[PDB]
Design a protein around this motif. Structure first.
Motif, PDB file in Angstrom:
ATOM      1  N   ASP A 102       0.783  -1.243   0.000  1.00 31.00           N
ATOM      2  CA  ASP A 102       0.000   0.000   0.000  1.00 31.00           C
ATOM      3  C   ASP A 102       0.822   1.305   0.000  1.00 31.00           C
ATOM      4  O   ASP A 102       1.722   1.474   0.826  1.00 31.00           O
ATOM      5  CB  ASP A 102      -0.983   0.007   1.180  1.00 31.00           C
ATOM      6  CG  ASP A 102      -2.264   0.723   0.843  1.00 31.00           C
ATOM      7  OD1 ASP A 102      -2.236   1.967   0.721  1.00 31.00           O
ATOM      8  OD2 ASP A 102      -3.304   0.036   0.693  1.00 31.00           O
ATOM      9  N   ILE A 103       0.491   2.239  -0.922  1.00 21.52           N
ATOM     10  CA  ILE A 103       1.160   3.549  -1.016  1.00 21.52           C
ATOM     11  C   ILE A 103       0.999   4.365   0.289  1.00 21.52           C
ATOM     12  O   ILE A 103       1.853   5.199   0.610  1.00 21.52           O
ATOM     13  CB  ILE A 103       0.672   4.347  -2.253  1.00 21.52           C
ATOM     14  CG1 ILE A 103       1.500   5.616  -2.456  1.00 21.52           C
ATOM     15  CG2 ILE A 103      -0.825   4.676  -2.165  1.00 21.52           C
ATOM     16  CD1 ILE A 103       2.962   5.344  -2.751  1.00 21.52           C
ATOM     17  N   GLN A 104      -0.061   4.083   1.075  1.00 18.98           N
ATOM     18  CA  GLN A 104      -0.267   4.762   2.360  1.00 18.98           C
ATOM     19  C   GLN A 104       0.911   4.520   3.311  1.00 18.98           C
ATOM     20  O   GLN A 104       1.157   5.346   4.176  1.00 18.98           O
ATOM     21  CB  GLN A 104      -1.571   4.272   3.034  1.00 18.98           C
ATOM     22  CG  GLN A 104      -2.205   5.325   3.938  1.00 18.98           C
ATOM     23  CD  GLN A 104      -2.730   6.507   3.158  1.00 18.98           C
ATOM     24  OE1 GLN A 104      -3.820   6.452   2.581  1.00 18.98           O
ATOM     25  NE2 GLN A 104      -1.970   7.608   3.124  1.00 18.98           N
ATOM     26  N   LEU A 105       1.627   3.389   3.169  1.00 20.48           N
ATOM     27  CA  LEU A 105       2.780   3.083   3.999  1.00 20.48           C
ATOM     28  C   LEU A 105       3.990   3.977   3.699  1.00 20.48           C
ATOM     29  O   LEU A 105       4.950   3.949   4.477  1.00 20.48           O
ATOM     30  CB  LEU A 105       3.187   1.614   3.855  1.00 20.48           C
ATOM     31  CG  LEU A 105       2.148   0.643   4.416  1.00 20.48           C
ATOM     32  CD1 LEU A 105       2.429  -0.766   3.959  1.00 20.48           C
ATOM     33  CD2 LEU A 105       2.063   0.775   5.947  1.00 20.48           C
ATOM     34  N   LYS A 107       3.870   7.212   3.882  1.00 12.08           N
ATOM     35  CA  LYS A 107       3.804   8.172   5.002  1.00 12.08           C
ATOM     36  C   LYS A 107       4.443   7.537   6.270  1.00 12.08           C
ATOM     37  O   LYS A 107       5.290   8.160   6.904  1.00 12.08           O
ATOM     38  CB  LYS A 107       2.348   8.594   5.267  1.00 12.08           C
ATOM     39  CG  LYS A 107       2.182   9.386   6.564  1.00 12.08           C
ATOM     40  CD  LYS A 107       0.742   9.868   6.745  1.00 12.08           C
ATOM     41  CE  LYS A 107       0.542  10.609   8.050  1.00 12.08           C
ATOM     42  NZ  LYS A 107      -0.864  10.498   8.562  1.00 12.08           N
ATOM     43  N   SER A 108       4.086   6.263   6.604  1.00 12.13           N
ATOM     44  CA  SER A 108       4.692   5.604   7.760  1.00 12.13           C
ATOM     45  C   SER A 108       6.204   5.501   7.621  1.00 12.13           C
ATOM     46  O   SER A 108       6.920   5.685   8.603  1.00 12.13           O
ATOM     47  CB  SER A 108       4.098   4.214   7.974  1.00 12.13           C
ATOM     48  OG  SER A 108       2.683   4.282   7.998  1.00 12.13           O
ATOM     49  N   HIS A 135       5.622  12.327  -6.265  1.00 11.16           N
ATOM     50  CA  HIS A 135       4.702  11.994  -5.179  1.00 11.16           C
ATOM     51  C   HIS A 135       5.492  11.689  -3.902  1.00 11.16           C
ATOM     52  O   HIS A 135       5.131  12.192  -2.824  1.00 11.16           O
ATOM     53  CB  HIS A 135       3.808  10.788  -5.591  1.00 11.16           C
ATOM     54  CG  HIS A 135       2.902  10.316  -4.498  1.00 11.16           C
ATOM     55  ND1 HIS A 135       1.822  11.061  -4.090  1.00 11.16           N
ATOM     56  CD2 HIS A 135       2.992   9.207  -3.719  1.00 11.16           C
ATOM     57  CE1 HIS A 135       1.255  10.376  -3.104  1.00 11.16           C
ATOM     58  NE2 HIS A 135       1.921   9.248  -2.848  1.00 11.16           N
ATOM     59  N   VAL A 139       5.075  13.515  -0.167  1.00  7.54           N
ATOM     60  CA  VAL A 139       4.822  12.845   1.106  1.00  7.54           C
ATOM     61  C   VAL A 139       5.906  13.226   2.117  1.00  7.54           C
ATOM     62  O   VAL A 139       5.578  13.509   3.273  1.00  7.54           O
ATOM     63  CB  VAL A 139       4.755  11.300   0.926  1.00  7.54           C
ATOM     64  CG1 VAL A 139       4.521  10.623   2.281  1.00  7.54           C
ATOM     65  CG2 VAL A 139       3.654  10.931  -0.072  1.00  7.54           C
ATOM     66  N   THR A 143       5.199  15.088   5.672  1.00  6.56           N
ATOM     67  CA  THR A 143       5.361  14.207   6.842  1.00  6.56           C
ATOM     68  C   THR A 143       6.575  14.479   7.736  1.00  6.56           C
ATOM     69  O   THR A 143       6.470  14.382   8.971  1.00  6.56           O
ATOM     70  CB  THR A 143       5.489  12.755   6.303  1.00  6.56           C
ATOM     71  OG1 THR A 143       4.358  12.461   5.467  1.00  6.56           O
ATOM     72  CG2 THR A 143       5.645  11.742   7.420  1.00  6.56           C
TER      73      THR A 143
END
Ligand SMILES: C[C@H](C(=O)O)[C@@H](NC(=O)c1ncnc2[nH]ccc12)c1ccc(Br)cc1
Length: 166
Positions: A102-105, A107-108, A135, A139, A143
């Protein structure tokens, strides 16, 4: 941490067209970031280049960390020695979106940088990890709150990033 020739993009994000290995030998920063995989196998790209500059000391150390602690998680990190390049190496795992992570990771992954006041880093999840590098910089900007000096190797990519940000 004697960084030279960077362009300031935001209050805390600086960028330079440079090889991160050469930057690390000139500056000897407190923290150098590695764009790692979960087993810390430094096969190519940024990881292979940093490992080669330590003459494989980073890989021998990483193999011992994995035997004792197990693999990292996607979005996670560990701090190991920086050998001749830095006081420490922060190994960070961004998602490999080409393999369904997942691309959301992303940010993590960038959140790990906030544990260190100043870092020398590459962009995460770029190249064969498959994320769009512009991209990834967005991020990073959204972040990271600590001071990060990004070394971008490809001059064509560096120019696109400076054009989209500054
Ligand atoms: C696309 C990007 C760039 O050109 O900056 C590239 N960076 C590099 O390989 C790179 N960046 C800086 N110093 C370097 N020395 C040797 C390699 C190198 C990259 C690819 C995949 C991932 Br995951 C992360 C970054």
């Amino acid at each position: 941490n004697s960084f030279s020739g960077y362009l300031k993009l935001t209050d805390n994000v600086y960028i330079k067209n440079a090889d991160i290995v050469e930057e690390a030998k000139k500056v000897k920063p407190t923290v150098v970031v590695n764009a790692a995989n979960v087993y810390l196998k430094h096969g190519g790209g940024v990881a292979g280049a940093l490992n080669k500059a330590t003459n494989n000391a980073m890989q021998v150390e990483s193999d011992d960390y994995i035997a004792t602690n197990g693999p990292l998680k996607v979005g996670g990190s560990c701090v190991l020695s920086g050998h001749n390049l830095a006081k420490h190496c922060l190994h960070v795992v961004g998602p490999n979106v080409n393999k369904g992570e997942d691309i959301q990771l992303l940010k993590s992954a960038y959140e790990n940088f906030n544990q260190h006041e100043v870092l020398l880093a590459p962009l995460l999840s770029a190249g064969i990890f498959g994320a769009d590098p512009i991209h990834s910089l967005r991020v990073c900007v959204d972040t990271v709150r600590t001071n990060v000096y990004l070394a971008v190797f490809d001059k064509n990519l560096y120019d696109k990033l400076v054009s989209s940000f500054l």
